[PDB]
Amino acid sequence: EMTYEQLARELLLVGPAPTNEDLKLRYLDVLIDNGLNPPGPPKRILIVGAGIAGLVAGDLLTRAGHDVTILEANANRVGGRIKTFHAKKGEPSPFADPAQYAEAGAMRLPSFHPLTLALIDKLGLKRRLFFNVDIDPQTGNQDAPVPPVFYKSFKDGKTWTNGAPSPEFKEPDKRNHTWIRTNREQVRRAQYATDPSSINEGFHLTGCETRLTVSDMVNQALEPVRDYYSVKQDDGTRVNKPFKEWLAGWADVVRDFDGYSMGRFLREYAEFSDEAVEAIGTIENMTSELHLAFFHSFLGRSDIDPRATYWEIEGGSRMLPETLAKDLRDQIVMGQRMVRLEYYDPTGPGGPAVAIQTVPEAATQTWTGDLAIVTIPFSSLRFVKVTPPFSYKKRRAVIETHYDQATKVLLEFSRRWWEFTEADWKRELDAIAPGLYDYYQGVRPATNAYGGGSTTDNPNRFMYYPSHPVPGTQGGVVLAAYSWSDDAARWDSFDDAERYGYALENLQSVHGRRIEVFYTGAGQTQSWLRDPYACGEAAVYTPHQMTAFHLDVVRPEGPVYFAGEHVSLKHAWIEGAVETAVRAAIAVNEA
Amino acid sequence: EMTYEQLARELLLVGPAPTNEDLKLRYLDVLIDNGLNPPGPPKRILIVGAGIAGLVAGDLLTRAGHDVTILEANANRVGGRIKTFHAKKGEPSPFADPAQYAEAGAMRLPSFHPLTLALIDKLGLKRRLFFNVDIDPQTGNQDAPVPPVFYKSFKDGKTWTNGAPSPEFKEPDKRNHTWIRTNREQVRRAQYATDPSSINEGFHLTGCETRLTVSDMVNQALEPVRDYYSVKQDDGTRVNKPFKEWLAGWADVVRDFDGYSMGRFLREYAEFSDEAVEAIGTIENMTSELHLAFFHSFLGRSDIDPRATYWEIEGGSRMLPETLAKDLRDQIVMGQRMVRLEYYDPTGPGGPAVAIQTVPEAATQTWTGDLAIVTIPFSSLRFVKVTPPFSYKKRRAVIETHYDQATKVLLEFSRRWWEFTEADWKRELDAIAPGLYDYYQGVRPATNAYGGGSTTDNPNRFMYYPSHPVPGTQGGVVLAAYSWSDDAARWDSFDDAERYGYALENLQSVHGRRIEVFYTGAGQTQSWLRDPYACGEAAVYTPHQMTAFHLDVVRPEGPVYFAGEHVSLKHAWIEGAVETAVRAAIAVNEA
Ligand SMILES: Cc1cc2nc3c(=O)[nH]c(=O)nc-3n(C[C@H](O)[C@H](O)[C@H](O)COP(=O)(O)OP(=O)(O)OC[C@H]3O[C@@H](n4cnc5c(N)ncnc54)[C@H](O)[C@@H]3O)c2cc1C
Ligand SMILES: Cc1cc2nc3c(=O)[nH]c(=O)nc-3n(C[C@H](O)[C@H](O)[C@H](O)COP(=O)(O)OP(=O)(O)OC[C@H]3O[C@@H](n4cnc5c(N)ncnc54)[C@H](O)[C@@H]3O)c2cc1C
């Protein structure tokens, strides 16, 4: 009963009654504006894990005078699931062009995630637009300074922002020239949007359902749910109800729908057919999430709203964690994997409150302190021996939280053929050989797309083209394959050469055999399940798990505090890790 | 509506109306007694995959005169998910004792799986009892010949059997001396059976639930379901209702419960608490199956009935597929992975009906024939290009069927310490060093167990001890770790040395630190997800998947027929693969 209101508070970043403070305001205050409240006690803090959560918490707590040590199992790299392939001075380069880079993990940051964007700005880092949908490159004006970060609180005309507006900045126009290739037929997204029957009949859709895009189908199925906490305007836009029944509405969403997977919600509640769910699970999101909890899809990484604006970091996503890491060169210990965690909650009495044993990745090493923030995924925590045991429900959450399997395959091309008009294909193909153009004319139209990506039901699933070229380069690296579960597992068990052949072949199925001429022979692969420090992409709740034990996930265990994407309810997002990191830094500062 | 009756028929091995023949009778007739009906057409048959399904189908169809070729991707091994670690004449031995062997895949065969057991007998192979529960070794009489295989049909006093009874054969008495270690407390199974409160309170169980074993909890939750098709006797044993409403009852089980996961069935229908489900998911089966379909647990690999008897093959489970393979040395082509499947359904007209391209594991190889039986898992089929496309629902089943991740870790010991009394620990520990015994007296009681295994919630989960010693050997190989999902993924990403240390340590948590002295330093690991020809343990349906598309799984596509565990509804069992193999052999014999 109160589980439901407390979960909606955790979900909505609402403080305890009766003040009901906006925690995102507090977090932006701390992280961006002030730093932490005057420390008071200066303490010895052990932070486990140098992903974004540990780096944000450690950078806060250190600047407040505490004695901080960050233990990182990886011997060469910080950032965790933020991972960019790029040329390193020791090693060779990942691609044939040493200037080329590409993402292995996080790649896009939404405008509705203010903590992270503001953090990137405060670190003096540059951001460009990330084109979720492919754009018309002769529209808008990106030369202007990026707009500031804006956040509107749920409260009394309370807003937060980063700086002055930049009215001369204009996003390019969505062009939707990219492909949907399902059931061996293929259309531009613009064609699918106006006549969804072309693709939907391929999934054996009939009746009313056939003439809706899967986006519309999904948004119509959700409108009665949105009604719990909001009213649609005259416009019709949505307006949140006043605070109380806005909060009591969300709490009844949790009560009514947490035992639903997204698929059972679509079949039994929205009354959609098997074929409608199959198409939704193919075009919009993935069939990953249909057996996952309803809440994972209504809040995770999905085509949120064409309304939304996305950003990327110039020079790679790694710039965020690696800049924070340089600020913390004295605190970060690399190559030390926590294998044992010992703590005292009223080591031992009088002495240190926490003791952590690490092992190198010089047989063991013991660390001590007063407080600890554990930010490692539960897939890692599972194999740490903890004494005394955690609370029962916390132990169950470690055992029962699943991580999803995801793999990214990246292919380097010497030219950005996805931008080519058929004219450009003529000019550039023949520039290499006498009649290379005529030699191909397995034939597809020219994609001629800037940004965005294509969707398919072959094992490549989602394909993304780089939003922006690497300055001074002539080619680009395509995210050729981004898939989950059994798809990802089969990707992982290929030899490297087989795997890039398969990814290239499936790319040709969409884009045309002739893309092969621009393939440099350089691929990279990231099998997040093969990563011993992640063992997956993100925490994914199955139905009922969130009310079963998520409140126990966030509770501290004596001197041990917890942070990371899995502690938030923004699973699979950077913003969830940054939120819970600030939240933990505030808490261990308190004592 | 008819989907439900046809699924119950597929489930119950009932032929079409109005004859309603017992297919298991037909399969035992064909496979064991006669061989196939006179062929008629002698044809050219391509079989893909040399697991048990392909070997059973090919051995039948060949002995009926057809021209059969079995294409096997693995370059060194047949049997697929039937895999025994053992000494090979080329390679070194898996363990320090070259006589030692242990299972990587299938290990136990139930008496209620007659096709397989009869097949093992007909191949002149030897079987011993597999002790699911640890036994009193001075009870029963295993010297006598094993009892014959008996099957009672659902029909009119129709029974099948293998041979004459063997009344002098007696199974040993269950002793339940093995451990349950959950929530840092530990009890013998015999103690848990009489006073389940000891373990159940560890899971925070209250009230009525606390005094039930999780087995009782599960069986009581299922009694109203069993009522759909059966009536419990006066005894009370269960008796199946007469045929019609026996079949109409099962069809309403499918209608009423297929949209339930096992967990939602326990929480919402049986009305069990979160803690009761947590304990059930820990002791009885695994928390694997709670988000899987209700039907996967009511039929998969689980503590079925203490009633049941299990068998193992002497010399290893590999003896079954490898004996069939020697009968087929001319038909089996090793090291050829199907990458392309082409077929004609009214190559091309007049010519061959099926064409299969393989690649070596001599750049490509093309095979042709009239009919094909594809027995490879859907995780492999996913990456084969098929032209023309399969039926829509068949393509969706390939995309949407999930395979579960399972890993087995095996540890060799020079002695069978799990059998030791404390006396034997004294005599044998001190036989190695002056006061080795006193040196240890991390202390646990002596296990003193023969067969069966122990259950825990640390990452090892289930631990099994060998039912029988290897004749003329003094030690044994323990299945130290058998786990799924995130547990298995973290097991897989350890170095080999780390992984066996972790498995040994968790074994010591249950059995006592002193087992280390008998550890030879030899481990083996099978990560079924890392296996490119399996990519998992077994097909696992999520809720509603069985009615969504399982009838489409079993349908042929022109000249292409399908077989394997996933085609049956006995997922994760050998018997399901043998059933669908016989079924396919019968069908392609028909033309
Ligand atoms: C493929 C992919 C794409 C993504 N795309 C996006 C996106 O577009 N936008 C977005 O917002 N988010 C995205 N994310 C999510 C985002 O990257 C993560 O949620 C976030 O980076 C997780 O941060 P964390 O600190 O919680 O965990 P982690 O990054 O996993 O940090 C944990 C750290 O702890 C270390 N560690 C682990 N075990 C131990 C141990 N035993 N001892 C010591 N150290 C240990 C690890 O080495 C690691 O450095 C994506 C994630 C993936 C996998
Ligand atoms: C850990 C584990 C324990 C088990 N324990 C038991 C048990 O106790 N009792 C029980 O009854 N069952 C058990 N099983 C289940 C049983 O082993 C399987 O269900 C059964 O062996 C599967 O047989 P199959 O022929 O359907 O598939 P497979 O054995 O997988 O056979 C498929 C074959 O096809 C080959 N192949 C794959 N892809 C290609 C390709 N592209 N081209 C060519 N060839 C290809 C593979 O190499 C393999 O040889 C267990 C399974 C596992 C994983």
mmCIF file of N, CA and C in Angstrom, chain A residues 183-184 202-204 264 267 274-275 278 282 287 291 337 339 382-383 385-386 389 392-393 395-396 400 402-403 457-459 485-487 489-491 493-494 498 502 506 509 529-530 532 535 544 548, chain B residues 183-184 202-204 264 267 274-275 278 282 287 291 337 339 382-383 385-386 389 392-393 395-396 400 402-403 457-459 485-487 489-491 493-494 498 502 506 509 529-530 532 535 544 548:
data_model
loop_
_atom_site.group_PDB
_atom_site.id
_atom_site.type_symbol
_atom_site.label_atom_id
_atom_site.label_comp_id
_atom_site.label_asym_id
_atom_site.label_seq_id
_atom_site.Cartn_x
_atom_site.Cartn_y
_atom_site.Cartn_z
ATOM 1 N N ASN A 183 10.276 -8.713 -43.190
ATOM 2 C CA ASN A 183 9.544 -9.720 -43.958
ATOM 3 C C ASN A 183 9.908 -9.662 -45.445
ATOM 4 N N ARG A 184 11.172 -9.354 -45.735
ATOM 5 C CA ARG A 184 11.747 -9.284 -47.079
ATOM 6 C C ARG A 184 11.189 -8.150 -47.930
ATOM 7 N N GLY A 202 2.824 -7.017 -44.097
ATOM 8 C CA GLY A 202 3.856 -8.040 -44.033
ATOM 9 C C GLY A 202 3.824 -8.834 -42.742
ATOM 10 N N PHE A 203 3.393 -8.205 -41.651
ATOM 11 C CA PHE A 203 3.243 -8.880 -40.374
ATOM 12 C C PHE A 203 1.879 -9.524 -40.224
ATOM 13 N N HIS A 204 1.091 -9.576 -41.305
ATOM 14 C CA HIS A 204 -0.242 -10.183 -41.307
ATOM 15 C C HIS A 204 -1.227 -9.414 -40.436
ATOM 16 N N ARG A 264 1.950 -8.761 -22.238
ATOM 17 C CA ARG A 264 0.623 -9.047 -21.711
ATOM 18 C C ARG A 264 -0.211 -7.776 -21.598
ATOM 19 N N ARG A 267 -1.519 -7.343 -25.206
ATOM 20 C CA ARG A 267 -2.471 -8.358 -25.652
ATOM 21 C C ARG A 267 -3.763 -8.318 -24.849
ATOM 22 N N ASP A 274 -1.700 -10.843 -31.736
ATOM 23 C CA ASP A 274 -0.338 -11.361 -31.801
ATOM 24 C C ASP A 274 0.472 -10.652 -32.882
ATOM 25 N N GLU A 275 -0.119 -10.452 -34.056
ATOM 26 C CA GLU A 275 0.626 -9.858 -35.160
ATOM 27 C C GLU A 275 0.953 -8.399 -34.890
ATOM 28 N N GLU A 278 3.880 -8.539 -32.592
ATOM 29 C CA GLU A 278 5.065 -8.938 -33.345
ATOM 30 C C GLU A 278 5.658 -7.762 -34.110
ATOM 31 N N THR A 282 9.126 -5.475 -33.379
ATOM 32 C CA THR A 282 10.134 -5.522 -34.427
ATOM 33 C C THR A 282 10.557 -4.142 -34.897
ATOM 34 N N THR A 287 11.743 -7.189 -29.513
ATOM 35 C CA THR A 287 11.000 -8.227 -28.823
ATOM 36 C C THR A 287 11.699 -8.596 -27.519
ATOM 37 N N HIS A 291 8.554 -9.586 -22.866
ATOM 38 C CA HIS A 291 8.430 -10.396 -21.662
ATOM 39 C C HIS A 291 8.979 -9.696 -20.425
ATOM 40 N N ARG A 337 40.093 -5.761 -8.308
ATOM 41 C CA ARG A 337 38.726 -6.283 -8.316
ATOM 42 C C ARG A 337 38.307 -6.671 -6.903
ATOM 43 N N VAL A 339 36.755 -8.616 -4.197
ATOM 44 C CA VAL A 339 36.329 -9.997 -4.038
ATOM 45 C C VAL A 339 35.715 -10.256 -2.673
ATOM 46 N N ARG A 382 27.202 -10.245 -7.196
ATOM 47 C CA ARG A 382 26.781 -11.618 -6.927
ATOM 48 C C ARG A 382 27.935 -12.497 -6.447
ATOM 49 N N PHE A 383 29.155 -12.245 -6.915
ATOM 50 C CA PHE A 383 30.284 -13.127 -6.639
ATOM 51 C C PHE A 383 31.229 -12.567 -5.597
ATOM 52 N N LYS A 385 31.987 -12.035 -1.684
ATOM 53 C CA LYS A 385 31.530 -12.532 -0.395
ATOM 54 C C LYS A 385 31.356 -11.341 0.544
ATOM 55 N N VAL A 386 30.194 -11.266 1.177
ATOM 56 C CA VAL A 386 29.826 -10.153 2.034
ATOM 57 C C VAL A 386 29.630 -10.704 3.433
ATOM 58 N N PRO A 389 25.975 -10.822 6.231
ATOM 59 C CA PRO A 389 25.071 -10.790 5.074
ATOM 60 C C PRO A 389 24.278 -9.492 5.023
ATOM 61 N N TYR A 392 17.871 -9.606 3.831
ATOM 62 C CA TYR A 392 17.350 -10.681 2.993
ATOM 63 C C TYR A 392 16.895 -10.182 1.620
ATOM 64 N N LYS A 393 16.092 -9.111 1.578
ATOM 65 C CA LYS A 393 15.556 -8.654 0.295
ATOM 66 C C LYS A 393 16.650 -8.081 -0.602
ATOM 67 N N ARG A 395 19.786 -9.222 -0.641
ATOM 68 C CA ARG A 395 20.407 -10.427 -1.187
ATOM 69 C C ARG A 395 19.562 -11.016 -2.311
ATOM 70 N N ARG A 396 18.240 -11.042 -2.143
ATOM 71 C CA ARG A 396 17.377 -11.547 -3.204
ATOM 72 C C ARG A 396 17.451 -10.665 -4.452
ATOM 73 N N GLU A 400 18.301 -11.998 -8.115
ATOM 74 C CA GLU A 400 17.179 -12.085 -9.040
ATOM 75 C C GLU A 400 17.184 -11.025 -10.136
ATOM 76 N N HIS A 402 18.151 -9.509 -13.396
ATOM 77 C CA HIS A 402 18.732 -9.986 -14.640
ATOM 78 C C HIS A 402 19.373 -8.825 -15.395
ATOM 79 N N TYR A 403 20.460 -9.129 -16.101
ATOM 80 C CA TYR A 403 21.091 -8.203 -17.026
ATOM 81 C C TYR A 403 20.868 -8.714 -18.445
ATOM 82 N N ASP A 457 14.424 -7.008 -39.435
ATOM 83 C CA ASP A 457 14.245 -8.214 -38.646
ATOM 84 C C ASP A 457 15.289 -9.290 -38.940
ATOM 85 N N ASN A 458 16.265 -9.020 -39.804
ATOM 86 C CA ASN A 458 17.399 -9.926 -39.873
ATOM 87 C C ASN A 458 18.275 -9.703 -38.633
ATOM 88 N N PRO A 459 19.242 -10.577 -38.371
ATOM 89 C CA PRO A 459 19.936 -10.490 -37.076
ATOM 90 C C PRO A 459 20.645 -9.150 -36.805
ATOM 91 N N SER A 485 19.998 -10.851 -26.775
ATOM 92 C CA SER A 485 19.511 -12.204 -26.448
ATOM 93 C C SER A 485 20.151 -13.237 -27.375
ATOM 94 N N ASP A 486 19.373 -14.093 -28.048
ATOM 95 C CA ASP A 486 19.949 -15.164 -28.855
ATOM 96 C C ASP A 486 20.669 -14.623 -30.087
ATOM 97 N N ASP A 487 20.159 -13.536 -30.679
ATOM 98 C CA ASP A 487 20.891 -12.850 -31.736
ATOM 99 C C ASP A 487 22.310 -12.497 -31.273
ATOM 100 N N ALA A 489 24.060 -13.607 -28.714
ATOM 101 C CA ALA A 489 24.845 -14.792 -28.381
ATOM 102 C C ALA A 489 25.450 -15.427 -29.627
ATOM 103 N N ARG A 490 24.683 -15.487 -30.729
ATOM 104 C CA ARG A 490 25.211 -16.099 -31.945
ATOM 105 C C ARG A 490 26.240 -15.191 -32.605
ATOM 106 N N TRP A 491 26.001 -13.870 -32.586
ATOM 107 C CA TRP A 491 27.031 -12.911 -32.981
ATOM 108 C C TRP A 491 28.327 -13.151 -32.216
ATOM 109 N N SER A 493 29.663 -15.757 -30.835
ATOM 110 C CA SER A 493 30.380 -17.018 -30.981
ATOM 111 C C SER A 493 30.925 -17.231 -32.386
ATOM 112 N N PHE A 494 30.754 -16.268 -33.277
ATOM 113 C CA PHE A 494 31.450 -16.300 -34.552
ATOM 114 C C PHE A 494 32.917 -15.927 -34.348
ATOM 115 N N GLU A 498 34.216 -14.141 -39.718
ATOM 116 C CA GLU A 498 32.832 -14.525 -39.988
ATOM 117 C C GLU A 498 31.874 -13.423 -39.547
ATOM 118 N N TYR A 502 29.125 -11.550 -41.865
ATOM 119 C CA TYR A 502 27.690 -11.642 -41.627
ATOM 120 C C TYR A 502 27.074 -10.265 -41.438
ATOM 121 N N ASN A 506 24.286 -8.626 -44.080
ATOM 122 C CA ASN A 506 22.957 -8.154 -43.692
ATOM 123 C C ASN A 506 22.786 -6.680 -44.003
ATOM 124 N N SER A 509 21.844 -6.538 -47.578
ATOM 125 C CA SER A 509 20.426 -6.853 -47.743
ATOM 126 C C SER A 509 19.550 -5.610 -47.694
ATOM 127 N N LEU A 529 27.987 -9.079 -22.707
ATOM 128 C CA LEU A 529 27.845 -10.245 -21.847
ATOM 129 C C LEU A 529 29.184 -10.929 -21.599
ATOM 130 N N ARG A 530 30.098 -10.858 -22.566
ATOM 131 C CA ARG A 530 31.448 -11.375 -22.389
ATOM 132 C C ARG A 530 32.292 -10.507 -21.468
ATOM 133 N N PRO A 532 33.481 -9.221 -18.210
ATOM 134 C CA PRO A 532 33.353 -9.774 -16.853
ATOM 135 C C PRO A 532 32.956 -8.744 -15.818
ATOM 136 N N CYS A 535 28.747 -8.112 -17.649
ATOM 137 C CA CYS A 535 27.932 -9.313 -17.874
ATOM 138 C C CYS A 535 26.557 -8.974 -18.422
ATOM 139 N N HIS A 544 6.612 -7.657 -11.720
ATOM 140 C CA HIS A 544 6.460 -7.687 -10.266
ATOM 141 C C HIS A 544 7.770 -7.497 -9.499
ATOM 142 N N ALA A 548 8.429 -6.074 -5.665
ATOM 143 C CA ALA A 548 8.943 -7.119 -4.789
ATOM 144 C C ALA A 548 10.152 -6.647 -3.986
ATOM 145 N N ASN B 183 20.589 -18.861 2.661
ATOM 146 C CA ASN B 183 20.557 -17.759 3.622
ATOM 147 C C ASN B 183 21.550 -17.985 4.766
ATOM 148 N N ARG B 184 22.692 -18.593 4.448
ATOM 149 C CA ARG B 184 23.796 -18.874 5.369
ATOM 150 C C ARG B 184 23.456 -19.895 6.446
ATOM 151 N N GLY B 202 14.265 -18.838 7.047
ATOM 152 C CA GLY B 202 15.352 -18.079 6.448
ATOM 153 C C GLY B 202 14.905 -17.226 5.278
ATOM 154 N N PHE B 203 13.880 -17.673 4.554
ATOM 155 C CA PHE B 203 13.311 -16.908 3.459
ATOM 156 C C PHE B 203 12.226 -15.959 3.928
ATOM 157 N N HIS B 204 12.072 -15.789 5.247
ATOM 158 C CA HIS B 204 11.077 -14.892 5.837
ATOM 159 C C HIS B 204 9.651 -15.360 5.575
ATOM 160 N N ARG B 264 3.693 -15.667 -11.921
ATOM 161 C CA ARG B 264 2.381 -15.051 -11.781
ATOM 162 C C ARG B 264 1.323 -16.085 -11.417
ATOM 163 N N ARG B 267 1.796 -16.415 -7.598
ATOM 164 C CA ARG B 267 1.427 -15.234 -6.818
ATOM 165 C C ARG B 267 -0.060 -14.928 -6.919
ATOM 166 N N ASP B 274 5.506 -13.355 -1.959
ATOM 167 C CA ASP B 274 6.818 -13.171 -2.569
ATOM 168 C C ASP B 274 7.851 -14.109 -1.954
ATOM 169 N N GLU B 275 7.851 -14.235 -0.630
ATOM 170 C CA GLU B 275 8.864 -15.049 0.029
ATOM 171 C C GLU B 275 8.680 -16.526 -0.277
ATOM 172 N N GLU B 278 10.134 -16.932 -3.681
ATOM 173 C CA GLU B 278 11.589 -16.863 -3.595
ATOM 174 C C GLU B 278 12.181 -18.187 -3.128
ATOM 175 N N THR B 282 14.269 -21.167 -5.263
ATOM 176 C CA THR B 282 15.630 -21.415 -4.814
ATOM 177 C C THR B 282 15.891 -22.880 -4.517
ATOM 178 N N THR B 287 15.087 -19.882 -9.997
ATOM 179 C CA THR B 287 14.371 -18.661 -10.318
ATOM 180 C C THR B 287 14.443 -18.388 -11.817
ATOM 181 N N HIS B 291 9.811 -16.428 -14.505
ATOM 182 C CA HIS B 291 9.330 -15.543 -15.557
ATOM 183 C C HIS B 291 9.057 -16.277 -16.864
ATOM 184 N N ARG B 337 29.015 -26.584 -41.879
ATOM 185 C CA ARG B 337 27.973 -25.762 -41.263
ATOM 186 C C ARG B 337 27.045 -25.206 -42.336
ATOM 187 N N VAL B 339 24.903 -22.800 -44.109
ATOM 188 C CA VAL B 339 24.786 -21.351 -44.130
ATOM 189 C C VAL B 339 23.683 -20.878 -45.062
ATOM 190 N N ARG B 382 18.536 -19.185 -37.089
ATOM 191 C CA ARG B 382 18.369 -17.738 -37.209
ATOM 192 C C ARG B 382 19.331 -17.124 -38.224
ATOM 193 N N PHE B 383 20.532 -17.678 -38.368
ATOM 194 C CA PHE B 383 21.570 -17.066 -39.190
ATOM 195 C C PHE B 383 21.760 -17.767 -40.519
ATOM 196 N N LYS B 385 20.452 -18.230 -44.293
ATOM 197 C CA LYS B 385 19.573 -17.567 -45.245
ATOM 198 C C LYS B 385 18.710 -18.629 -45.922
ATOM 199 N N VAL B 386 17.405 -18.396 -45.932
ATOM 200 C CA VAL B 386 16.434 -19.342 -46.451
ATOM 201 C C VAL B 386 15.739 -18.680 -47.624
ATOM 202 N N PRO B 389 11.339 -17.557 -48.388
ATOM 203 C CA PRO B 389 11.102 -17.447 -46.943
ATOM 204 C C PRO B 389 10.150 -18.527 -46.451
ATOM 205 N N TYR B 392 5.269 -17.005 -42.408
ATOM 206 C CA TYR B 392 5.465 -15.888 -41.488
ATOM 207 C C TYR B 392 5.604 -16.348 -40.036
ATOM 208 N N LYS B 393 4.691 -17.205 -39.561
ATOM 209 C CA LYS B 393 4.729 -17.600 -38.151
ATOM 210 C C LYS B 393 5.949 -18.462 -37.839
ATOM 211 N N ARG B 395 8.907 -18.081 -39.339
ATOM 212 C CA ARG B 395 9.970 -17.087 -39.219
ATOM 213 C C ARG B 395 9.912 -16.384 -37.866
ATOM 214 N N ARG B 396 8.712 -16.043 -37.397
ATOM 215 C CA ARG B 396 8.589 -15.416 -36.087
ATOM 216 C C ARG B 396 9.032 -16.362 -34.970
ATOM 217 N N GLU B 400 11.779 -15.478 -32.216
ATOM 218 C CA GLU B 400 11.275 -15.188 -30.879
ATOM 219 C C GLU B 400 11.547 -16.283 -29.854
ATOM 220 N N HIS B 402 13.547 -18.169 -27.343
ATOM 221 C CA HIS B 402 14.735 -17.913 -26.546
ATOM 222 C C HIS B 402 15.366 -19.232 -26.112
ATOM 223 N N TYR B 403 16.695 -19.230 -26.016
ATOM 224 C CA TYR B 403 17.452 -20.329 -25.442
ATOM 225 C C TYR B 403 18.043 -19.864 -24.115
ATOM 226 N N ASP B 457 21.976 -21.256 -2.492
ATOM 227 C CA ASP B 457 21.732 -19.998 -3.175
ATOM 228 C C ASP B 457 23.009 -19.211 -3.467
ATOM 229 N N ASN B 458 24.184 -19.749 -3.145
ATOM 230 C CA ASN B 458 25.393 -19.135 -3.669
ATOM 231 C C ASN B 458 25.507 -19.483 -5.159
ATOM 232 N N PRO B 459 26.412 -18.842 -5.893
ATOM 233 C CA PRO B 459 26.378 -19.012 -7.354
ATOM 234 C C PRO B 459 26.546 -20.461 -7.847
ATOM 235 N N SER B 485 21.694 -18.073 -16.488
ATOM 236 C CA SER B 485 21.438 -16.628 -16.628
ATOM 237 C C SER B 485 22.657 -15.827 -16.170
ATOM 238 N N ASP B 486 22.506 -14.856 -15.263
ATOM 239 C CA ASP B 486 23.623 -13.995 -14.883
ATOM 240 C C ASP B 486 24.688 -14.759 -14.102
ATOM 241 N N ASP B 487 24.279 -15.731 -13.277
ATOM 242 C CA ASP B 487 25.239 -16.629 -12.648
ATOM 243 C C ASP B 487 26.151 -17.272 -13.700
ATOM 244 N N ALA B 489 26.703 -16.450 -16.840
ATOM 245 C CA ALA B 489 27.491 -15.461 -17.570
ATOM 246 C C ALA B 489 28.737 -15.056 -16.792
ATOM 247 N N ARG B 490 28.612 -14.886 -15.465
ATOM 248 C CA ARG B 490 29.772 -14.484 -14.675
ATOM 249 C C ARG B 490 30.749 -15.642 -14.522
ATOM 250 N N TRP B 491 30.232 -16.869 -14.349
ATOM 251 C CA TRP B 491 31.073 -18.061 -14.428
ATOM 252 C C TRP B 491 31.876 -18.083 -15.722
ATOM 253 N N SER B 493 32.971 -15.781 -17.718
ATOM 254 C CA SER B 493 33.943 -14.730 -17.998
ATOM 255 C C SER B 493 35.115 -14.731 -17.026
ATOM 256 N N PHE B 494 35.163 -15.679 -16.105
ATOM 257 C CA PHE B 494 36.360 -15.884 -15.308
ATOM 258 C C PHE B 494 37.431 -16.573 -16.153
ATOM 259 N N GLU B 498 40.638 -18.921 -11.921
ATOM 260 C CA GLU B 498 39.673 -18.244 -11.057
ATOM 261 C C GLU B 498 38.395 -19.067 -10.933
ATOM 262 N N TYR B 502 36.702 -20.386 -7.494
ATOM 263 C CA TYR B 502 35.388 -19.951 -7.038
ATOM 264 C C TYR B 502 34.456 -21.135 -6.836
ATOM 265 N N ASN B 506 32.935 -22.236 -3.106
ATOM 266 C CA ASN B 506 31.511 -22.365 -2.798
ATOM 267 C C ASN B 506 31.170 -23.775 -2.358
ATOM 268 N N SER B 509 32.007 -23.903 1.244
ATOM 269 C CA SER B 509 30.948 -23.279 2.034
ATOM 270 C C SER B 509 29.890 -24.281 2.474
ATOM 271 N N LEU B 529 26.195 -21.404 -23.710
ATOM 272 C CA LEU B 529 25.941 -20.189 -24.470
ATOM 273 C C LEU B 529 27.125 -19.820 -25.356
ATOM 274 N N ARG B 530 28.341 -20.156 -24.927
ATOM 275 C CA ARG B 530 29.528 -19.956 -25.745
ATOM 276 C C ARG B 530 29.616 -20.940 -26.901
ATOM 277 N N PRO B 532 28.809 -22.273 -30.255
ATOM 278 C CA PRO B 532 28.192 -21.628 -31.425
ATOM 279 C C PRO B 532 27.131 -22.476 -32.091
ATOM 280 N N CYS B 535 24.252 -22.223 -28.470
ATOM 281 C CA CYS B 535 23.940 -20.882 -27.960
ATOM 282 C C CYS B 535 22.945 -20.926 -26.814
ATOM 283 N N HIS B 544 2.492 -17.202 -23.313
ATOM 284 C CA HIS B 544 1.690 -17.053 -24.526
ATOM 285 C C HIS B 544 2.404 -17.495 -25.805
ATOM 286 N N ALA B 548 0.843 -18.806 -29.410
ATOM 287 C CA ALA B 548 1.112 -17.859 -30.484
ATOM 288 C C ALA B 548 1.659 -18.550 -31.730
#
